[PDB]
């Protein structure tokens, strides 16, 4: 009976929302707001505690990119701030390996980071690891076989279809089979030993195509596409199904939440977010 948490996002301005959805009863919870509003953040969980990493506060008054790590305990319904990252990271990618949070890529103004840094909850310290081969913002991240994959994004010049693996024990990056489609701002997650990359922006249009990396074969195969095209969308997995959340379809801000069943290979509309938004963080606990 774990919930799908969603933090922040954008609609006219950067948002402070923290909300949880329960697929068993189809209900939404209104939880404690973020201390500082933000969009283009990422979510993750370590030891039952939700973390919200980076992003930016694009308000009416102006724009400030975030280096902040804040931590939310479900049991106490309270946000607590943690040690900040070495640099700010808007459109950040995040993954978890052995209770350590990896901050991947993202931007600060005109700087498009290829750096990566690693958070240790028990010490509350950030340390730089080996940087990625390509600079990436709008980057999907997915932990699989204890390796961290950085998929797609924007390099400062072009939208990317390239992906690359990180090796924590060796501390080094390696390119892998590039994607069928170009995808910046895609939702990237891990279901049944495969990486799925859903949605995103190819350089011209928004996307509903979903493609699946098999590790053994090293090839990306298309699966059934989404009903609603989207970019800068939220994504997670909950009990053997992929959930995509909100986003921007070129015209409007989505509150649609679609759900992928891998057995039937069919997407379906399950619920609506309480208000349409893009650039949310998402995690499950």
């Amino acid at each position: 009976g774990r919930l799908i948490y969603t933090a922040g996002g954008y609609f006219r301005q950067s948002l402070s929302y923290l909300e949880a959805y329960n697929p068993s009863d189809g209900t939404w919870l209104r939880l404690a707001d973020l201390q500082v509003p933000r969009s283009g953040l990422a979510g993750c969980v370590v030891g039952g505690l939700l973390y919200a990493v980076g992003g930016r506060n694009n308000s009416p008054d102006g724009n400030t990119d975030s280096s902040a790590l804040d931590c939310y305990n479900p049991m106490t319904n309270q946000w607590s701030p943690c040690a900040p990252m070495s640099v700010p990271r808007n459109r950040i990618g995040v993954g978890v390996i052995d209770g350590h949070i990896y901050a991947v890529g993202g931007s600060h103004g005109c700087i498009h980071h290829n750096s990566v840094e690693r958070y240790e909850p028990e010490r509350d310290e950030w340390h730089l690891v080996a940087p990625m081969l390509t600079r990436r913002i709008g980057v999907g991240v997915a932990v699989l076989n204890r390796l961290l994959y950085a998929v797609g994004g924007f390099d400062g010049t072009n939208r990317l279809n390239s992906a690359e693996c990180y090796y924590p024990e060796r501390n080094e990056w390696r390119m892998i089979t590039a994607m069928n489609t170009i995808r910046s701002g895609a939702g990237v997650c891990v279901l049944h030993n495969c990486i799925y990359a859903a949605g995103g922006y190819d350089g011209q249009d928004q996307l509903n195509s979903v493609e699946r990396y098999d590790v053994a074969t090293a090839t990306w195969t298309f699966v059934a596409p989404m009903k609603h095209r989207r970019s800068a969308l939220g994504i997670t997995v909950h009990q053997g199904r992929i959930y995509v959340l909100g986003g921007y379809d070129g015209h409007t801000f989505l509150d649609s939440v679609e759900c992928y069943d891998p057995d039937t290979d069919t997407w379906s509309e399950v619920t609506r977010m309480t208000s349409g938004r893009s650039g949310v963080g998402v995690a499950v606990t």
């Binding site: 954008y10 969009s39 724009n63 800068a232 801000f253 893009s278 650039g279």
Partner: peptide, 9 residues
């Protein structure tokens, strides 16, 4: 107007 996020910078 960012085409990917829809944010107005």
């Amino acid at each position: 107007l960012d085409p990917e996020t829809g944010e107005f910078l």
